[PDB]
Amino acid sequence: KAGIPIGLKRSQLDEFKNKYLKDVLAKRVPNPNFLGNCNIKDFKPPYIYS
Amino acid sequence: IPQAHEIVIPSYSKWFNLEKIHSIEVQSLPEFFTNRIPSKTPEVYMRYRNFMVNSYRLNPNEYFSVTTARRNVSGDAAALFRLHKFLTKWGLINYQVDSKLLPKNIEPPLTSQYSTRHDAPRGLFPFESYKPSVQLPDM
Amino acid sequence: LINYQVDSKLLPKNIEPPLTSQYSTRHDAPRGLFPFESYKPSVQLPDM
Amino acid sequence: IDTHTATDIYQTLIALNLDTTVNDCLDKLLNDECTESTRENALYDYYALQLLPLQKAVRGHVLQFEWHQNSLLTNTHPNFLSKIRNINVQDALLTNQ
Amino acid sequence: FSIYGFSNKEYISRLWHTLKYYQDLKNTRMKSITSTSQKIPSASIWGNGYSGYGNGITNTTTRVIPQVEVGNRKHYLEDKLKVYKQAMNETSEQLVPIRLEFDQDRDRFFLRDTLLWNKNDKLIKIEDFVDDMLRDYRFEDATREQHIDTICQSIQEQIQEFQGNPYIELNQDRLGGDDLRIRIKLDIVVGQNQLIDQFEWDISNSDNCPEEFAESMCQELELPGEFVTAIAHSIREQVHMY
Amino acid sequence: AQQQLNKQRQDFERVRLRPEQLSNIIHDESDTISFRSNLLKNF
Amino acid sequence: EKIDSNKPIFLFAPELGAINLHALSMSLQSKNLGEINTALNTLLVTSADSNLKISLVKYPELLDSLAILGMNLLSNLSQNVVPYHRNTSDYYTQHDKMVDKIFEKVNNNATLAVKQWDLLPEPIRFLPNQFPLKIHRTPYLTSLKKIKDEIDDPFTKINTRGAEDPKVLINDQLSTISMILRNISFSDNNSRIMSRNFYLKRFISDLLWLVLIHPENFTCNRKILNFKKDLVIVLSNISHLLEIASSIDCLLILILVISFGQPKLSESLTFNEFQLQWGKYQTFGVDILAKLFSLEKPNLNYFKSILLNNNHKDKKLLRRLLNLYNDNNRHNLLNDVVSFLFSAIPLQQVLSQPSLLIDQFSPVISQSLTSILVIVQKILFNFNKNLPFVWLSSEENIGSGLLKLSEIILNIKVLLPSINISCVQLIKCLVEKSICFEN
Amino acid sequence: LKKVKILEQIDENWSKEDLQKLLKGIQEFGADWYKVAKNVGNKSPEQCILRFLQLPIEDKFLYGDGNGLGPLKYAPHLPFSKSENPVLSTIAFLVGLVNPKTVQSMTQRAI
Amino acid sequence: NGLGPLKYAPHLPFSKSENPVLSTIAFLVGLVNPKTVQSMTQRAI
Amino acid sequence: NECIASTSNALKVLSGDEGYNEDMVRRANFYKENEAMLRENIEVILSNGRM
């Protein structure tokens, strides 16, 4: 019901995140309630250079 | 269960913390913190509140109603109504039900990340830079 | 005097949604809450 | 007495003393006839003196935010306008009624 | 010559450079205002404000919005003086078991539900509660506006015929009660399953709490909360019938 | 017809409670006080 | 000066975007300093603007928030407490309890209450620290002189800033709240809603008490004068529906209203002309009185009792305050109120030179006459001084001015027929009251 | 010389190894507070930032433990003139030395 | 280190000394009528 | 002392300058005395992604 595939182990978590990519590729447009698709983005401080 | 969605709350609900009870909750819902009714204690309050929040954050896209809470936890419907309204009022639940996308911004100069200079004035930022004293007597 | 030996995780428990306490949350802030900033400061010791 | 040159001298002396103590930490590191306590203290003092300007930057960031939090327009703009009006005929008509 | 000099000319040079910077900053701020006026969204030196969520979207022209509807509803605003007045003078928690049943070959809609309501409650109006409930079931506007009155009357009648618990309004409370024991029979059809059960229950004892008993049974059989609330309501209903 | 009374009340109050502006609103001292000029004079 | 005019201090109205009243209310109700200050600044910039309506009908709780916030601040200001950065935490079946309590007792031997609190704090005058010793009745011109003297000092503390002194911060928050209330009172729906609000009237009472009885905790004289101006303007916009809650509120309202006149230096009138260009804040006091007297219910009974002469605490405080004001020194308050009302009628200025001036001044003349007539006919035997006769023979000869005004209006624009009758009625009633009082 | 003995900030909730991990982690990752926190372990990012801000690195090189700096205390704005107002600058330096009570006594004796 | 900020006061080395402190003292005490100075402090002759 | 302080502050205000005193905020006492303020600010800045 939560949307996790099934029987996920502690080792598969990041693969799950990668699976998320596959999820939108298999069109589909992600919501703002989608992991990594937030409307709010970080605003870096001045001492961070880049 | 891993986090599957993104969870946003308003900035004025920063005080909220599970496994803790703030003074705002005590002031707004006093019925649970006066020892007058034995079926309304802080333990029952945390039980109901954490149930509601956990059950909402599993699918932020959907409205979490009072009928489901009334059906899944046992108590009089009036207190559950009051608690659900308090929660949905302070953010903390139903805040991202029908969310919209921000189209795209056009950025004029100085409104962007990495837009800061060494030659810019230091309005706040109390630390100042001084002229090095390079003169033979001062040396 | 009753059920002392039974392994924990075998005791009965409520059927409830799992916990969401270890989650990361983002905050939605109003407009004039943070100041405008200039002056990227050194971040490195000056040569002498 | 010249105060401007005095402050310039004070600041330049601060900078020079920082540089000499960094050099001395490097010195205590580069020779092996020192003990382990001396070498460890030198290495971590080197780390701290090299992080000093980052500390200044982060302190300045937090202090900027803190100064902005306590600011109100009534203090900075003492001549802010409001919505005065005159007593008119409608007030008198309403009072009589 | 350094701009970080105290003399007279360096101080005024610094002031001039600061002024020029702030003038071009004001120019970009006017650019942002103008660009947003022509319905082209532009970034601002103050950020975006609230993004698309609750609290809506800042970065429009300019408005005063009273609130943003959540789930097509308005926020509930209550009277805090009445809240404290009720909370600071409370003594008991008289609970009424309420049952709603409406067929279709009768009043037009069909709906079934069970509920517990505190009779010593003066804070929440039954009309608001019923309107919210009918919004939760996703009824159309027309049907809700038609049948809220019927549902409110049905709920209001059952509260009035709940005289109460006799052993409380008449002070008996003998710490073990009398021995009046009845059989309580359950038949609950949550989901695709049906729980059938029967057990003895003493109705003279004010220590018997149906919530704890239902919770224990549903823990021991691994059942969800729907069964918990249904069992508590059934116990209370039959006890009150007797 | 209670809505007509309400429309009349609205028309009356919009005229009565309207604030003056950039006009005869003339302010006293303690409103038109320049802090900058006093600071300079005292310096 | 140019740099200050171009600096990015806060947003102005065209760049606030969509303003959300619910979010501002919730910001005010949180206990974060930055949230509160941002909400206050946004509310000020919005409410001060034209073309932007803050409708309280569509979100009324906002008002409560503001008032409630103000109240707490006033409390913290009176008892020398600072609410922010507290260095505290800010967090927090009978059979089973019998059983586990037996368990605890057994294990201890082996090893060998209801809460009550209020939503708001007790008003501001029942606090044991706030007991009246002196009434501060500084006139308006003297207050302006004090403001000029305190700004024109070399060692002036007028720009300490909010981050360098917490008391300055509390005072700035209170000033912003008062300005916001004043700005939003200028509409029909908002004024009607604000007239019946319970928290607003309690906030007004607390602020009146602190401004008139214990003003030592404010940091500036200009802030005191601005509090007074905001109070009279709000009351002027609201008093057509206001029901007063206490008698102490009536006393403080009278003192506040008459403080805006010009006293001279009892047997004569104690107030001067208070010209025309000097100020226009007196007209607001005249208007407040004329409308408040209109309600022959709680308001009229209170004013009668005060002018002619927890409830136990209120009686003790009323006696204390009346003795503090009058110190045969009785009915000094009646004399002052009526002399203030008479000094509001610009007789010398209109009679000296004529139609234009009375056309511009008919509202204040109308309402001044209304208030004086109500006092003379309905309020007026503990007297020991023929008061209407000292009003008639006052060396300023107001009767001649009233008659001359009547004549000027006769040889002469919706109020004049009422002003004629009011003038003649007032003269006649004063003469008859003179005779009866002497009897 | 003067040594910035950093490893003596051992205040109970922190420890010498905790401080070492903090300093080395900030030296590794500049301002990635999460990586620094997980480098230290057992402590959250906010505690790391607080401890970093409270470290007294520069204090030994500044003028005093807390007399006073005098005019230098107002460093960016110094309204003094050696040429035009020679007495006020000297007196600004001198007021730090004297005891004010004896000054009051002496001026009262003079009057 | 008794004198706090006097350490940082500039001065020309090796030649042509100037005395700000003593000059200021002699100027300020040269205005006040030596008899009341003798009464002020015991240091004066 | 009061005269010197007021003259320096007047110059600061007339130049259009603001901020903290630099000598006060370069020292470590200021950060062990304002512990609560710093904690609250750090949390607010972090949780918003500004730090």
mmCIF file of C-alpha atoms in Angstrom, chain E residues 15-16 18-19 22-23 25-26 29 33 44-46 50 55-68 75 77 79-81 84 88 207 209 212, chain G residues 2-3 5-23 29 52-53 58-61 93 95-96 115-119 198-199:
data_model
loop_
_atom_site.group_PDB
_atom_site.id
_atom_site.type_symbol
_atom_site.label_atom_id
_atom_site.label_comp_id
_atom_site.label_asym_id
_atom_site.label_seq_id
_atom_site.Cartn_x
_atom_site.Cartn_y
_atom_site.Cartn_z
ATOM 1 C CA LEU E 15 30.470 55.348 0.159
ATOM 2 C CA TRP E 16 30.250 56.090 -3.572
ATOM 3 C CA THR E 18 28.287 51.283 -2.033
ATOM 4 C CA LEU E 19 25.759 53.717 -3.490
ATOM 5 C CA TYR E 22 22.628 49.659 -4.293
ATOM 6 C CA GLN E 23 21.378 51.643 -7.286
ATOM 7 C CA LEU E 25 20.296 46.430 -7.161
ATOM 8 C CA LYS E 26 17.213 48.655 -7.167
ATOM 9 C CA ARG E 29 14.299 44.881 -8.359
ATOM 10 C CA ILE E 33 8.404 43.793 -10.596
ATOM 11 C CA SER E 44 13.244 37.801 -6.859
ATOM 12 C CA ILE E 45 15.927 38.794 -4.372
ATOM 13 C CA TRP E 46 13.535 37.696 -1.609
ATOM 14 C CA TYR E 50 5.314 29.761 -0.615
ATOM 15 C CA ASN E 55 -0.720 28.230 1.443
ATOM 16 C CA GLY E 56 -0.790 28.374 -2.359
ATOM 17 C CA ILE E 57 1.729 30.074 -4.625
ATOM 18 C CA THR E 58 3.311 33.438 -3.966
ATOM 19 C CA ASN E 59 4.983 35.154 -6.933
ATOM 20 C CA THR E 60 1.831 36.415 -8.631
ATOM 21 C CA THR E 61 0.955 40.042 -9.280
ATOM 22 C CA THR E 62 -0.404 41.019 -5.849
ATOM 23 C CA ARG E 63 -3.504 39.915 -3.951
ATOM 24 C CA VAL E 64 -4.935 39.466 -0.511
ATOM 25 C CA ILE E 65 -6.128 35.865 -0.269
ATOM 26 C CA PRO E 66 -8.021 34.953 2.922
ATOM 27 C CA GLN E 67 -6.903 31.315 2.691
ATOM 28 C CA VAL E 68 -6.279 28.429 0.315
ATOM 29 C CA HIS E 75 -10.324 25.912 7.771
ATOM 30 C CA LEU E 77 -12.039 28.344 13.445
ATOM 31 C CA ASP E 79 -13.999 30.007 20.047
ATOM 32 C CA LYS E 80 -11.156 29.553 22.522
ATOM 33 C CA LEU E 81 -13.013 31.022 25.498
ATOM 34 C CA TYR E 84 -11.406 26.689 28.041
ATOM 35 C CA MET E 88 -11.939 23.638 32.992
ATOM 36 C CA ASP E 207 -14.863 -0.863 35.990
ATOM 37 C CA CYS E 209 -14.172 -0.664 29.948
ATOM 38 C CA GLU E 212 -9.480 -2.073 26.522
ATOM 39 C CA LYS G 2 20.914 58.205 -0.762
ATOM 40 C CA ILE G 3 22.343 54.878 0.452
ATOM 41 C CA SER G 5 17.008 55.288 0.395
ATOM 42 C CA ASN G 6 18.359 52.514 -1.876
ATOM 43 C CA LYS G 7 19.166 49.853 0.734
ATOM 44 C CA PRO G 8 17.208 46.554 0.701
ATOM 45 C CA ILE G 9 15.545 46.677 4.124
ATOM 46 C CA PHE G 10 12.173 45.063 3.432
ATOM 47 C CA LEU G 11 9.727 44.468 0.610
ATOM 48 C CA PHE G 12 7.360 47.129 -0.603
ATOM 49 C CA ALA G 13 3.785 46.442 -1.641
ATOM 50 C CA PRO G 14 4.283 45.677 -5.379
ATOM 51 C CA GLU G 15 6.595 42.751 -4.554
ATOM 52 C CA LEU G 16 4.732 40.961 -1.767
ATOM 53 C CA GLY G 17 2.978 38.726 -4.293
ATOM 54 C CA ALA G 18 -0.113 36.908 -3.099
ATOM 55 C CA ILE G 19 -0.689 37.673 0.588
ATOM 56 C CA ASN G 20 -2.221 34.880 2.672
ATOM 57 C CA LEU G 21 -4.161 35.859 5.783
ATOM 58 C CA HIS G 22 -4.260 32.346 7.239
ATOM 59 C CA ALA G 23 -0.490 31.961 7.001
ATOM 60 C CA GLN G 29 0.395 32.315 16.772
ATOM 61 C CA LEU G 52 -5.470 46.374 -0.878
ATOM 62 C CA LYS G 53 -8.404 45.297 1.294
ATOM 63 C CA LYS G 58 -13.531 36.190 5.294
ATOM 64 C CA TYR G 59 -10.912 35.377 7.937
ATOM 65 C CA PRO G 60 -11.787 36.800 11.366
ATOM 66 C CA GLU G 61 -9.414 34.801 13.587
ATOM 67 C CA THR G 93 -7.984 2.769 34.189
ATOM 68 C CA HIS G 95 -7.583 -0.458 38.545
ATOM 69 C CA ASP G 96 -4.349 -0.674 36.547
ATOM 70 C CA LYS G 115 -4.584 21.580 36.581
ATOM 71 C CA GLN G 116 -6.228 24.970 36.063
ATOM 72 C CA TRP G 117 -5.010 27.822 33.888
ATOM 73 C CA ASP G 118 -6.539 30.629 31.867
ATOM 74 C CA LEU G 119 -6.204 31.401 28.177
ATOM 75 C CA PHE G 198 -13.743 40.522 23.011
ATOM 76 C CA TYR G 199 -9.948 40.408 22.801
#
